[PDB]
Amino acid sequence: ASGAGKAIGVLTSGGDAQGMNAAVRAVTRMGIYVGAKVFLIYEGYEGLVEGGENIKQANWLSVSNIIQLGGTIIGSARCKAFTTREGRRAAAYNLVQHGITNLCVIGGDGSLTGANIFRSEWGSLLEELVAEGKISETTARTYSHLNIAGLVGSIDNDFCGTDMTIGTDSALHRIMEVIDAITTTAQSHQRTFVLEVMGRHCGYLALVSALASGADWLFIPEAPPEDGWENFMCERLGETRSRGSRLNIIIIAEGAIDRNGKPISSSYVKDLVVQRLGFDTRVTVLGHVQRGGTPSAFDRILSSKMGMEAVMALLEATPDTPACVVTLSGNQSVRLPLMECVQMTKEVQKAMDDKRFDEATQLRGGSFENNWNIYKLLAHQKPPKEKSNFSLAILNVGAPAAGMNAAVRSAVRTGISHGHTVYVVHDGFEGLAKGQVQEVGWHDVAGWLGRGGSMLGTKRTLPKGQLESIVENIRIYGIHALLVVGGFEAYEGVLQLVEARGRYEELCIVMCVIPATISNNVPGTDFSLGSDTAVNAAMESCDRIKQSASGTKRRVFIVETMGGYCGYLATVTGIAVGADAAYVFEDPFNIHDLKVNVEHMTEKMKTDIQRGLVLRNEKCHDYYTTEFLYNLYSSEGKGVFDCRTNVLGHLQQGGAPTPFDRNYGTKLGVKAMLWLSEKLREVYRKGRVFANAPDSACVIGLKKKAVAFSPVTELKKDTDFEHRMPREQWWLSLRLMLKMLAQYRISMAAYVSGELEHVTR
Amino acid sequence: ASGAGKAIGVLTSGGDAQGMNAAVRAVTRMGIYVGAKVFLIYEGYEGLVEGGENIKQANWLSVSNIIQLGGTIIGSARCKAFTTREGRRAAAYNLVQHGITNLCVIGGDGSLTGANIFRSEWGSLLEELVAEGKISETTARTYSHLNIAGLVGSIDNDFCGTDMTIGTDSALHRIMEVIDAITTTAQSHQRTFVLEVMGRHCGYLALVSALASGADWLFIPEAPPEDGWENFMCERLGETRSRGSRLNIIIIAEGAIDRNGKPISSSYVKDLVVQRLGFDTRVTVLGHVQRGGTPSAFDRILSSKMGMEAVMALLEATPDTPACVVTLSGNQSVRLPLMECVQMTKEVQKAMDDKRFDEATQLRGGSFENNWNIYKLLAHQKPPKEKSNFSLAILNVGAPAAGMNAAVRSAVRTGISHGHTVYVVHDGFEGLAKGQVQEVGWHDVAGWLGRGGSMLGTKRTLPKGQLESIVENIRIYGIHALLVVGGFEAYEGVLQLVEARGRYEELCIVMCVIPATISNNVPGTDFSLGSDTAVNAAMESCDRIKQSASGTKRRVFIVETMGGYCGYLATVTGIAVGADAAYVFEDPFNIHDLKVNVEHMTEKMKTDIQRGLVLRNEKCHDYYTTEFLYNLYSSEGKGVFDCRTNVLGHLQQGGAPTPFDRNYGTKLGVKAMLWLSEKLREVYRKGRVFANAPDSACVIGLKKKAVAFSPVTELKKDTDFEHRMPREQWWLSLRLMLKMLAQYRISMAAYVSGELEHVTR
Ligand SMILES: Nc1ncnc2c1ncn2[C@@H]1O[C@H](COP(=O)(O)OP(=O)(O)OP(=O)(O)O)[C@@H](O)[C@H]1O
Ligand SMILES: Nc1ncnc2c1ncn2[C@@H]1O[C@H](COP(=O)(O)OP(=O)(O)OP(=O)(O)O)[C@@H](O)[C@H]1O
Ligand SMILES: Nc1ncnc2c1ncn2[C@@H]1O[C@H](COP(=O)(O)OP(=O)(O)OP(=O)(O)O)[C@@H](O)[C@H]1O
Ligand SMILES: Nc1ncnc2c1ncn2[C@@H]1O[C@H](COP(=O)(O)OP(=O)(O)OP(=O)(O)O)[C@@H](O)[C@H]1O
Ligand SMILES: Nc1ncnc2c1ncn2[C@@H]1O[C@H](COP(=O)(O)OP(=O)(O)OP(=O)(O)O)[C@@H](O)[C@H]1O
Ligand SMILES: Nc1ncnc2c1ncn2[C@@H]1O[C@H](COP(=O)(O)OP(=O)(O)OP(=O)(O)O)[C@@H](O)[C@H]1O
Ligand SMILES: O=P(O)(O)OC[C@H]1O[C@](O)(COP(=O)(O)O)[C@@H](O)[C@@H]1O
Ligand SMILES: O=P(O)(O)OC[C@H]1O[C@](O)(COP(=O)(O)O)[C@@H](O)[C@@H]1O
């Protein structure tokens, strides 16, 4: 099973997407965990060409304390030698001199194209190399096959076969930090903010940025503006002013073009707006800022997971299997052949070269086209000449979660677009009982994207107590559908209403649960809306806490995280921050395990790593509290390290939503409203709605691959109501990666890696 | 476990209730099956007193070919010697001479009172016997405890602790055969039929007869008529005439009295009716006819079951446990202490002696009072000044079953009494889809009791195909409840309509399934309405067939019964007729089992018993058909016996309902309507009936002890839809009794006997 006797090469090439260091760390630490020799190739294909000093064998401490660093400690370089066979043969020679039959390439589309051409010629290169006399025929029959596992490390997301790439999320963090500087201020005078992103080839960053910020206008190369857009844009900004909206946002990609090949410059749009509107227009250009900063939490977890799966795919790969790219489509890990992804990239580039240009956007991926349609729909209120008698109420229940507002905004706009009479109820089920029901318009949710917490009130109160009041108000307002955006209490309350359909006719209405909670404890989803924000806030505090010991001082920090009994937040934060241990409820631990972990920490602190960090979920243990672990670690570490405690309380809660959470809540809010409208049409009968099947009350998912609708009655089997969490949680396999990355010898035979899948046309 | 080394005495005393021979046969055969010696005490307590020749040890063939005989082959006698200690001591002596420490007494209330006084004095009698010198002190310390298991064999049902007694059902068969002679004729002129039953002490037979026949008037000693009943009765008969009803039935018990002690004679009621009405009045007095004829099927099964359980209770009885009476309350076997039952009998007799006379009827048992209330309610239409907006439709679905009409009649009257607008739909779900709904009145169900089959049409078509039509007709007619009287198709169709509540608002109505089928294959009940009739017709054909060999030719009959895959009908019929084997689907058999049974038959047929009888369920085996078994038995029995075949087709189907089926369907029809009305009030909300919980659609039961309401959705787990039968059937334990009575050595550790229960006040 183990990959002993074989060596793994890891290199980074292209633009230094932040989170590359997390991928390199995971690749290295998996390769020497399984016994393989790991060789670090510095400067990418450059050091591959020159070789020699640029190829060094890695130890466990070679990738120590790099996970929080952006860029790449390995270094990346543009080399033209790898383009030509003269340098590529030298690269093959230097790999053979170290017995490196396994190569992991972390880079963009050009990097992976070079890796594909390098595999395709590996046999021919070895033949020409032995022919020229630099390697004997023996020692060339071995190493006859080169194994390539690709990792898409780039901010562009231009690699067509893959949905999400390393560094895209963090580039979005940089972009939205800049936009939030503008939008969160008390907007005082009429001004226009024109943001220029570096999406020269791919406009994905421009698109998701526009969606996350609610941009008034978007210039992306995939969909250039129609002729006469000059007037159309200026009029849009004009009515925006007339509304009283004091700030317009124009997101213009670097690759912005018109229907011809002529590029549209940010300076042109600036001067255009200034001339016709007179708004204070200034162009903000990020430039290098997008590649900068720390990697986001998402980037660290996903880079670590993909780097691990890249190594594992590189050991189980026989001479026959092709070069693969380890990526995630949705939440599911998958391997795609490198050749097909390169071919699709070439097809989209040719299409974008005025071949099938209007039909190139679909080949970019369904996510791009769907994102652009959602953006345009939510941007400007088109007239819904269609009307329907249906009327729906949007609830916010439970704790506040970052991204509830984004979900409610999208739900309101999409429902108005379908002609529904959208109500919003303040304080969730309490207001539904008390009749705090307010008909909502398009502009009533204006600017709700970036606001954290909940504009609508949240209450944890379940509907069972005031069930008579709830059905009374449903009858009064004629609420045909109920959109409940919230945590476990949202799901549990919808479950109580569905169970109470037996008693009350008025509860025979279509219900939908959007899981939105910090704990990520809602059954029927992988990511509750706002768990990403909490994880990012948690790691930032943990990185700060870890940064506080300096120089010589050897100190361990016990950090207590929230999340109730659900350990998700603790474990992922421990992965993102390189925590030594993340004690959670789902992995019960006794004093024997504690002494093991403490002695492990002590031995580690005698090495050159000096800042240990262990996370404690708040409800992992009844007796082994944070004070208990403080006392244990400080006593046993006496004379080796000091121990300190920090309970991250509500520092993980009130933050503004991360860009992932905004886009996520935006999209599933749209999808929830699409599903609500489809189910209401499917269920309208005899002049009324009568939703009484269990599939008419569902939790909107994202369960493995795509968005799902799991009926609440079906989820009740797999729900631990006492602990308020699901019985089977997808993330428990990540404990194995955490423990592996902290030198804990854990037989991870229970970990399942994504299998090969062909590209979806 | 086995009762080896001990002897059992069996005696019969009192009036020879038919079915006593079945009890004696089961007692004897179980006693020598478990290794105990069985002693037959002829003439009851008489032969107990004289003893000697009157006490003979039994072999298996001593009780051979008696199960179909009424009376008692042991013989019964009134003896005054057992009243006095002079004869009772002689009885104790004669029991000790044979080592009979175990006594089974089959008799009425006086018989069991004598048995109680005999146990209570058994120690004193033995002491006085050893004192007088007829038994040594040794041989008296052994036998110091006498074990008494009582069996209530009488037509009176006067024993208060017990609900049903041996011979009551068959006495009712005789009574209703006489009444059906009158009612089934084309009633030509105005005549009054005054039936006098021998219920001198107990009026249970008079009561159940009146209920089964729909008597116009009832004179029972438990509830004497009020003063001035002369006028009240004559007026009732007068309006009966004015209706056009041409026949009046007056059931007068022998013990009929007025509010004083003065008895009311049948001749007086005759002359009274003649004088005031002039109807052709003739008094029919059954006399000895009630005790006559064959025992009914019910009597044979229940006598065999109770005789077996009496023996088993007689072996597991230690010196401390008291004398018990083995009886069935409902369908559940139970043992009641003899002392408490005797005490209750004395209390009711004292109460009936003008002490608590108006409150004596409740101490008689809840079944008596409920039966009398149901009788009076259904007899005469009282004005329902109460009204309710509810309306209900009565369906007959599946095959016709004897007793559907009785259920429909009671449902109609009871629903009209509660003010509901009762509808009847012809052809079940077909007519409900086709709108064959007909509002029904009180007199539209007049005389439906004794009519076999279904007066409403029956169809097997499930409602799923025409579901849009069914909901349309429910909406048009405003049906708020749905009473479905029928077999497995009835249950399955109600299950489909409940499952379709998710789709159709109009199906959110209260539903009730009355199981009515020959096969007894409906889950949620022990006795489908009309299974008793089919069993009785099946045994009567089998008895005829077994009698056709005429005591000289050695012949086996392969008799094929109906019942689908459900073997209930075959097995109980085999018990009733003493069939050698009852092949059924639920007990899969191969050729090895067939050779075992065939060799067993050949050995049996070489002995004194010359008429063999094997039953085959129509769908018990795919290949071993009736013809197969015929060929097998006739070939292997060559030179020993001949084989014949008889497929009882629809002979088991079209009969009039037995008296059990009429009373049963009458009572559960009332109870179904009570439950419907209670559930409709429980579920009426906001100006409409909205029944959507699963407990609003139930199968009326009689599952173990009393009537139950099992929700159809809960029963779906234990329902084998492919074979159209329940997965766990209560009657599989009766196979062991069949096989034991046929000399098959079967380890019946799986049989469970009723435990001790105190009387229910
Ligand atoms: N067709 C190719 N053949 C061989 N090598 C290639 C090919 N394309 C790119 N490379 C090599 O990969 C290196 C980096 O590729 P590239 O310029 O496209 O950056 P990238 O990976 O796409 O990252 P980013 O999009 O963010 O800028 C190049 O310097 C070149 O050495
Ligand atoms: N928020 C926006 N950002 C960028 N372009 C936009 C936006 N809204 C509209 N457009 C562009 O303006 C053009 C016409 O806009 P409009 O929606 O009013 O007509 P349309 O027929 O419905 O176009 P379409 O449905 O294909 O998007 C579209 O081609 C679209 O590309
Ligand atoms: N983080 C924030 N907190 C509080 N208020 C905010 C925040 N961001 C924007 N706002 C307010 O929301 C108001 C609405 O204007 P805003 O620019 O935000 O949205 P919009 O462009 O007009 O419509 P849309 O949301 O659909 O894009 C702004 O005037 C601003 O005061
Ligand atoms: N109190 C008693 N003590 C002793 N023996 C009794 C007592 N009562 C009845 N017996 C005995 O039981 C015998 C039959 O009892 P009984 O006359 O009451 O008939 P039965 O069992 O009640 O049947 P049925 O009611 O149908 O007529 C009597 O002949 C008598 O020998
Ligand atoms: N079918 C019947 N057979 C015998 N007696 C009857 C019948 N119907 C009524 N009676 C008797 O006539 C008496 C009065 O009858 P009625 O029902 O009209 O008044 P009641 O107040 O309702 O009496 P109850 O409710 O106690 O039965 C009752 O005591 C009852 O015993
Ligand atoms: N076995 C039968 N088959 C067919 N018709 C029957 C049968 N028995 C009775 N009937 C008919 O039912 C008609 C109704 O009168 P019936 O005596 O039977 O009942 P009722 O006394 O008038 O009312 P209720 O049923 O409530 O006691 C009779 O005229 C008779 O023709
Ligand atoms: O109950 P949820 O849905 O998991 O809400 C998450 C928040 O609730 C908590 O239990 C604490 O909430 P409170 O501070 O209000 O008491 C934490 O898990 C977290 O801060
Ligand atoms: O299907 P059910 O409910 O068991 O009906 C009982 C009757 O149906 C049968 O299957 C035969 O009916 P048919 O003669 O009409 O075909 C027998 O079991 C029995 O005579």
Ligand SMILES: [Mg+2]
């Ligand atoms: Mg690129």
Ligand SMILES: [Mg+2]
């Ligand atoms: Mg008696």
